[PDB]
Design a protein around this ligand. Structure first.
Ligand SMILES: CC(C)[C@H](C)[C@@H](O)[C@H](O)[C@@H](C)[C@H]1CC[C@H]2[C@@H]3COC(=O)[C@H]4C[C@H](O)[C@H](O)C[C@]4(C)[C@H]3CC[C@]12C
Ligand SMILES: *[C@@H]1O[C@H](CO)[C@@H](O[C@@H]2O[C@H](CO)[C@@H](O)[C@H](O)[C@H]2NC(C)=O)[C@H](O)[C@H]1NC(C)=O
Ligand SMILES: *[C@@H]1O[C@H](CO)[C@@H](O[C@@H]2O[C@H](CO)[C@@H](O)[C@H](O)[C@H]2NC(C)=O)[C@H](O)[C@H]1NC(C)=O
Ligand SMILES: CC(=O)N[C@@H]1[C@@H](O)[C@H](O)[C@@H](CO)O[C@H]1O
Ligand SMILES: *[C@@H]1O[C@H](CO)[C@@H](O)[C@H](O)[C@H]1NC(C)=O
Lengths: 733, 175
């Protein structure tokens, strides 16, 4: 009978090829995902099998299994909306999450026909709660419910879920929705876990009541403020308290310390000195986040007692005084220390060479530290340091090559310092190294060829240094290079015709240098490449047609997540070139950006765009940015330059580019900024260029251009200056 | 700022299937960094160009909050709804392009308040009502193309409309 339900399911798969070991002859138990207990089937798990079918399919077939205790469909691409269905009193668990499920959330009430079901996780789907809040969920036999990261918007929806009463509910998670207003779990006396993160609660700070059982409270990521201390005082039973990303103000309040292990008060309005009373919480306290608040003074020494604290992060506060080594050696718990964005001062303790052995990640960036980088830092044979963030500090003198002695180092960021003399060739030996960021320093000489023995090297950011000489060729051995930013150097030579070999290269920025000679057509071989900023240079040649060849097949999702700035070119200064500067900023501070002033002429009177890198497409996209401005680059701009759907900015300015603008230039739909200005281009501006409906900027100025301006479309919104100096042009608009 | 608040209210009333408004960031200080939104040297909004975003939705009242807004192009979308009279509270303005939409209801008389307005295309929509005699008022308007939506009530010549061909009327159920 049962078997036949299981093949009855198999039918609906489109896509019959999944569940191949499911066949009528065999005994159901031998089936993929099918688990039996005494030769009867208690559970099916199809997880991460692309079922691509309706929910009501699944339930008609499976949920009717006499005796089935659980079903796991998570990430099955289960489609549809959850209806009433006949269901057995033995199915106690359902994982429908990482799915496509739709409708009102009220759909879920139907599951009341499944009488034994204590476990539901629907998270990461589309459920919304469209009209207005009342009725109930009326699923009260539930110990665990996870509705998180769905499409739900409302208020007292938390009240709605718990409405028919919560008594046996241990675990409740509604995160990553828009739910708002009041939370009361006060009735729920078994409740060990409440996750309300990433929501709209601006008002009620939850009412936990007795709080007898609660070990996990995540109220992070709301507009929530108000007195939380008094709220949570009833517990002392609690393992995690996450109140981060909220509106909380004031001194760190009395909060229960007995079982507290993780505590993040991070990213709030909290002011004051890290309190003594915190204290005995060191018994456990395996991690602490006070970062992003108003705190000052220095790391209170009692922090030597948490030998259980793996990671202390104090980043972005007023903390001052020199680097508290006295405390820092005492906690042999410590793994990551984040001191970033603070007023810590002084030279770099010798006395610190030890951390370098214990520590995974040392983040000292954006502080006042001076003198050089301890050559002796990595002298321990023991040394584990994965992540060294010394960027944005006052460190003088050469990069210690002895630093290679840190052999676990993946990310080395020395940037925004005063470091002089050359780049250690030494660094070539860091065999696990991925991110290397040296930009805005006084480093000179050549870009060390040895960097080739790094087979994991992903980032390379050299900007605003004196580095001379060509591109090291050995880099063609770096398979994982994605973001190469060499801008603002004296670098010579050409683009490597091998550059097209790096499947992963995404952002290549060669601005302000002397790099010369033709634009390599092999550039069209790079599946990942979305940002090409060649501006202010000595390049020869004509834009090749092969250059775009890959557009439309493009996947850039690797480069995604890296933090940056864009400084947009004011244009108001004669001297300043390009469309704009895309700079790596991680842990470099915003307000120290003027430290750039003397190297880059541009106004920081500008608007600085910025945030974490996110390509607007996953797969089958196009080159997102191209600036070839200010070169001797010349000739016919190919028809193929139309082949870039996702291209945001095109600046071909100040060149000898000649001939006429191809009609296809109308098909760059995602083009917001078009600058062909200051060229030898002639002829007429095709009215098919009306098609750029997102354009906020045009400059066609300084050409042999003739004819009328094509008014229908965005063109009329553009001040006539931007068409100036085309004697043969028919328009003003 | 109140401006980011406003445009936010728009990102809500709107529906953004091509995710053009994604970059609009409600925590941000100003919405000056948003995509397609732009500002002056003083960090107030001078533009919003969502024009042809495949974006659907209703326009919204908070849209009146952008007093330095000049060019606003909501044009060539699936936008439904009426044209909010606080659109008139946007005193500076140049171009108003609602053209090529499904916007329903009266062409608001409050546009009589935008003296700087140099462009009006209420063109190609479905609108219902008079024209105001208050758009005779403005006199700048080097173009008004409102066509293709049913109005009548008359075709004004109070005369600021003196400067317009009827090519500007095309099917108004007019006169
Ligand atoms: C995908 C990566 C390469 C990239 C860093 C990416 O994540 C990044 O967020 C991109 C898409 C943004 C950051 C800076 C942006 C540009 C900043 O420059 C500007 O001129 C603005 C103004 C205006 O709003 C335009 O519509 C967008 C426009 C022209 C932006 C277009 C999109 C960007 C280029
Ligand atoms: C609900 O299911 C989701 C997705 O199946 C679970 O989220 C994953 O769980 C693993 C283990 O916690 C984590 O490593 C990931 O961070 C989670 N991914 C997601 C969706 O963020 C979630 O744990 C489930 N919740 C319950 C109560 O079972
Ligand atoms: C405390 O809460 C914050 C915010 O809800 C958590 O932050 C997020 O962690 C995930 C990684 O799984 C990131 O993708 C998010 O971007 C983070 N947000 C922030 C604050 O930047 C934080 O992890 C929580 N702490 C713990 C350990 O539970
Ligand atoms: C060698 C060189 O270019 N240096 C100049 C520097 O004098 C100036 O302070 C800056 C401002 O634009 O421009 C750069
Ligand atoms: C490139 O480098 C020099 C060195 O300062 C700088 O002065 C010049 O302005 C830079 N060129 C551009 C366009 O920034």
């Amino acid at each position: 009978r049962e078997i036949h339900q299981l093949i009855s399911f198999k039918d609906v798969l489109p896509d019959k090829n999944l569940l191949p070991d499911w066949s009528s002859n065999k005994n159901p138990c031998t089936f993929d995902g099918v688990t039996c207990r005494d030769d009867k089937v208690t559970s099916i798990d199809l997880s991460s099998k692309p079922l691509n079918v309706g929910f009501s399919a699944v339930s008609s077939s499976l949920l009717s299994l006499t005796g089935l205790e659980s079903l796991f469909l998570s990430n099955s691409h289960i489609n549809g909306s959850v209806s009433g269905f006949k269901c057995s009193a033995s199915l106690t668990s359902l994982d429908l999450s990482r799915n496509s499920l739709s409708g009102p959330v009220t759909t879920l009430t139907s599951l009341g026909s499944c009488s034994g079901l204590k476990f539901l996780n629907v998270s990461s789907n589309t459920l919304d709660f469209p009209g207005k809040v009342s009725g109930g969920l009326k699923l009260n036999s539930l110990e665990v419910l996870d509705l998180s990261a769905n499409s739900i918007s409302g208020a007292n929806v938390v009240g709605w879920v718990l409405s028919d009463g919560c008594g046996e509910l241990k675990h409740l998670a509604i995160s990553g929705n828009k739910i708002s207003g009041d939370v009361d779990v006060s009735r729920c006396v078994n409740l060990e876990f409440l996750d309300v993160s990433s929501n709209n609660f601006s008002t009620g700070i939850p009412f936990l009541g007795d709080c007898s059982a609660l070990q996990h409270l995540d109220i992070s990521g709301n507009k929530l403020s108000g007195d939380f201390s008094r709220a949570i005082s009833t517990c002392t039973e609690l393992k995690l308290l996450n109140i981060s990303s909220n509106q909380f103000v004031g001194p760190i309040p009395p909060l229960p310390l007995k079982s507290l292990q993780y505590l993040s008060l991070a990213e709030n309005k909290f002011t004051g000195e890290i309190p003594d009373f915190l204290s005995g919480a060191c018994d456990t306290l395996t991690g602490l986040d006070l970062s992003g608040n108003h705190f000052y003074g220095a790391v209170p020494p009692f922090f030597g007692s948490c030998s259980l604290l793996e990671s202390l992060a104090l980043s972005s506060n007023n903390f001052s005084g020199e680097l508290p080594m006295d405390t820092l050696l005492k906690m042999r718990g410590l793994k990551v220390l984040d001191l970033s964005f603070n007023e810590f001062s002084g030279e770099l303790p010798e006395s610190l060479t030890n951390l370098s052995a214990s520590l995974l990640t040392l983040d000292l960036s954006s502080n006042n530290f001076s003198g050089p980088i301890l050559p002796n830092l990595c002298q321990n044979p023991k040394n584990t340091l994965q992540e060294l963030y010394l960027q944005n500090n006052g460190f003088t003198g050469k990069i210690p090559p002895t630093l290679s002695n840190c052999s676990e180092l993946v990310s080395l960021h020395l940037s925004f310092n005063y470091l002089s003399g050359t780049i250690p060739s030494s660094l070539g030996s860091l065999s696990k190294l991925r991110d290397l960021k040296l930009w805005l320093n006084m480093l000179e000489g050549e870009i060390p060829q040895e960097l080739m023995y790094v087979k994991t090297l992903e980032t390379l950011i050299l900007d605003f240094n004196d580095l001379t000489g060509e591109i090291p060729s050995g880099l063609s051995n770096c398979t994982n290079l994605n973001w190469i930013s060499l801008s603002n150097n004296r670098l010579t030579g050409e683009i490597p015709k091998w550059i097209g070999r790096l499947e992963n290269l995404a952002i290549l920025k060669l601005s302000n240098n002397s790099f010369s000679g033709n634009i390599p057509a092999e550039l069209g071989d790079c599946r990942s490449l979305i940002w090409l900023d060649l501006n202010t240079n000595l390049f020869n040649g004509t834009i090749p047609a092969a250059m775009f060849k890959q557009s439309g097949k493009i996947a850039a999702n690797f480069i995604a997540g890296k933090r940056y700035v864009y400084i947009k070119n004011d244009g108001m200064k004669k001297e300043c070139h390009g469309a704009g500067n895309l700079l790596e900023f991680q842990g470099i501070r915003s307000e120290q950006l003027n430290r750039l002033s003397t190297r880059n002429p541009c106004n920081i009177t500008s608007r600085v765009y910025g945030g974490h890198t996110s390509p607007t497409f996953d797969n089958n996209g196009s080159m997102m940015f191209l600036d070839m401005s200010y070169n001797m680059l010349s000739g016919y701009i190919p028809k193929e330059i139309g082949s870039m759907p996702y291209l945001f900015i095109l600046n071909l300015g100040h060149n000898d580019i000649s001939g006429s603008i191809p009609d296809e230039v109308g098909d760059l739909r995602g083009l917001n900024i078009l600058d062909l200005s200051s060229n030898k281009l002639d002829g007429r501006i095709p009215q098919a260029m009306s098609a750029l409906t997102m354009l906020t900027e045009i400059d066609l100025s300084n050409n042999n251009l003739s004819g009328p301006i094509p008014e229908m479309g965005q063109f009329e919104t553009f001040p006539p200056a931007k068409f100036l100096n085309n004697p043969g042009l028919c328009g003003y608009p | 700022n109140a401006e980011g608040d406003a445009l936010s209210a728009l990102k809500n009333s709107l529906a953004d299937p091509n995710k053009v408004l994604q970059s609009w960031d409600a925590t941000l200080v100003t919405p000056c960094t948003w995509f397609h939104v732009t500002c002056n040297s003083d960090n107030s909004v001078t533009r919003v160009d969502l024009g042809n975003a495949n974006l659907s939705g209703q326009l919204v009242m908070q849209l009146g909050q952008l007093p330095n807004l000049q060019y606003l192009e909501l044009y060539s979308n699936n936008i439904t709804g009426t044209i909010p009279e606080q659109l008139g509270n946007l005193t500076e303005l140049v171009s108003l392009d609602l053209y090529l939409n499904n916007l329903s209801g009266p062409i608001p008389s409050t546009l009589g308040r935008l003296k700087k307005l140099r462009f009006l295309r209420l063109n190609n929509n479905s609108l219902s009502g008079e024209i105001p005699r208050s758009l005779t008022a403005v006199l700048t308007l080097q173009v008004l193309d409102l066509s293709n939506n049913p109005l009548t009530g008359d075709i004004p010549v109070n005369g600021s409309f003196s400067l317009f061909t009827p090519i500007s009327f095309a099917n108004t159920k007019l006169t």
